Amino acid sequence: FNGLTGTGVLTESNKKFLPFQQFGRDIADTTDAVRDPQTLEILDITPCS
Amino acid sequence: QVQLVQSGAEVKKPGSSVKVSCKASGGTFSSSAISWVRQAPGQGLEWMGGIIPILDITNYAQKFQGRVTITADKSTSTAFMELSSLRSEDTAVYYCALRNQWDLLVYWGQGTLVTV
Amino acid sequence: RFASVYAWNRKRISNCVADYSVLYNSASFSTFKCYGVSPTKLNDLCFTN
Amino acid sequence: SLSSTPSALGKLQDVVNQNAQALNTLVKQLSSNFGAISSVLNDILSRLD
Numbered sequence A: 001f002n003g004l005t006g007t008g009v010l011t012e013s014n015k016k017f018l019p020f021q022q023f024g025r026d027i028a029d030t031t032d033a034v035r036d037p038q039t040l041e042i043l044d045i046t047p048c049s
Numbered sequence B: 001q002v003q004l005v006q007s008g009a010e011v012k013k014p015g016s017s018v019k020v021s022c023k024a025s026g027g028t029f030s031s032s033a034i035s036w037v038r039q040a041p042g043q044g045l046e047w048m049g050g051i052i053p054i055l056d057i058t059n060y061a062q063k064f065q066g067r068v069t070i071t072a073d074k075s076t077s078t079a080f081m082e083l084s085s086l087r088s089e090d091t092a093v094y095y096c097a098l099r100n101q102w103d104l105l106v107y108w109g110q111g112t113l114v115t116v
Numbered sequence C: 001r002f003a004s005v006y007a008w009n010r011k012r013i014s015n016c017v018a019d020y021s022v023l024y025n026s027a028s029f030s031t032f033k034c035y036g037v038s039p040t041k042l043n044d045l046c047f048t049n
Numbered sequence D: 001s002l003s004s005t006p007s008a009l010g011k012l013q014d015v016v017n018q019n020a021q022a023l024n025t026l027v028k029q030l031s032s033n034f035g036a037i038s039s040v041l042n043d044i045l046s047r048l049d
């Protein structure tokens, strides 16, 4: 997603990003959500297993 | 150094279509914009349309909003244009030219003569 | 025409695609050095500002 | 007496609280540079060779 790499599972979510926010981060600076660049949906990211 | 190989001359009949290829060299097929122009005998040189293969976006001149198809084949680094519903008024020498991003030069071919 | 160094010229680039392969591979530059990024990954990344 | 005195079970509560802190520390320690350009392996790998 715009240069942000990794492995995981995308799900839809209800985090409400502010207009200027592009990515979310958890407690360990792990991207835990992104805004999709073409359709501006918020997608949560979790580990595969 | 970029050079463009043009198709040879062709004689068409009214109502037919003509397709002209543009073979790139110097690579840079993606990242460059390819334009097509035509010069009818006795006239100046007129832009018809063009395509940017990496974006897969094609733009046309207003007089050519229809009858002209511009496409590209990345695997052979070749651009193409086809003009349909031909009439004798379509006689022209057709040219492709490249304008690479990162540059300001335009690389021109020799010219393809098509009459109808 | 280039600016004098005492009064250098800075421009904004936006809403576009950049294939950095050309600058990188061209042998014309005397210096090509990147800071913080690998020159060869410039095409995988997406940048702002 | 047990119902009314909130500190009555502190000896057990403390075990729980100490172990929780031990894990919270490990998670928080992930967000450190340790001299690296960033705390995230994916960013290091994404931009550098």
Ligand SMILES: *[C@@H]1O[C@H](CO)[C@@H](O)[C@H](O)[C@H]1NC(C)=O
Residues within 6 Å of the ligand: A037, A038, A039
């Ligand atoms: C991007 O282009 C596609 C067509 O290729 C279109 O369906 C989509 O809505 C466009 N998205 C945005 C944000 O413009």
